[PDB]
């Protein structure tokens, strides 16, 4: 979990490759990201996404999404082959100015939205993780300002969830609605930034922040850490703090 006596920082007690050479999040450095013209511009292909359910996972919620066949997958950019959608979830603050786990310049936004994706090689999310290119996770900084009316449903059903194991069937839902007008991107070789931490990860960045209301973002905050009938702990703060960079290079598509 998150809190004063199991958060991240003590994570590396069980998951020694917390201090690996290749974790995440980072923060972006903008003047010393490297222009590589040889990246491809994204390939989003999310027109036949089936939503399936939303789950609070005790560290999250998550929307999963059928990965059955290629019906919503991500290709280009840094990438080689197909990777299909499983599942999208946030990391966000207590306050506005806190909750992305990746910064910009050591600015910090109020949350993240992570879109997570695996190789279709591998057959299937388990095996992928295994691997070095295993998953690639599109990342997305949300700024408090207007509402995002495609994120409405998701925090309309956020009532029936509320702690720690609750499902709810969520079906019909387009991830569309919640992409940038640019999809610019930086691109960073790194790890999940849960446990257990495995460095599987092609990180795909965006530029350009999405913004949501206050409102929609307090109702993110009213979510439950613990399961029905256990004292109530607040979800938030869910987020890892930046990690070293140590022997990697982010990249940039655009200059
Ligand atoms: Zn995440």
Redesign the pocket.
């Given at each position: 979990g998150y809190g004063k006596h199991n958060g991240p920082e003590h994570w590396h007690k069980d998951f020694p490759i917390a201090k690996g050479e290749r974790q995440s999040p980072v923060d972006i450095d903008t003047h010393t990201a490297k222009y590589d013209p040889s990246l491809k511009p994204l390939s989003v292909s999310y027109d036949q996404a089936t939503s399936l359910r939303i789950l609070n996972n005790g560290h999250?919620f998550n929307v999963e999404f059928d990965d059955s066949q290629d019906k919503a997958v991500l290709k280009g950019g840094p990438l080689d082959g197909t990777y299909r959608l499983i599942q999208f979830?946030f990391?966000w603050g207590s306050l506005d100015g806190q909750g992305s786990?990746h910064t910009v310049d050591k600015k910090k936004y109020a949350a993240?939205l992570?879109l997570?994706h695996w190789n279709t090689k591998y057959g299937d999310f388990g095996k992928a993780v295994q691997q070095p290119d295993g998953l690639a996770?599109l990342g997305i900084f949300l700024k408090v300002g207007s509402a995002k009316p495609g994120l409405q449903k998701v925090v309309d059903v956020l009532d029936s969830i509320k702690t720690k194991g609750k499902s709810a069937d969520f079906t019909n839902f387009d991830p569309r609605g919640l992409l940038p007008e640019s999809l610019d991107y930086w691109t960073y070789p790194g790890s999940?930034?849960?446990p257990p931490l495995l460095e599987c990860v092609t990180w795909i960045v965006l530029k350009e922040p999405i913004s949501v209301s206050s409102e929609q973002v307090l109702k993110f905050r009213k979510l439950n850490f613990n399961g029905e009938g256990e004292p109530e702990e607040l979800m938030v703060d869910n987020w890892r703090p930046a990690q070293p960079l140590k022997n990697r290079q982010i990249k940039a598509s655009f200059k």
């Open positions: 999250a979830h990391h786990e993240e992570h997570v996770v999940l930034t849960t």
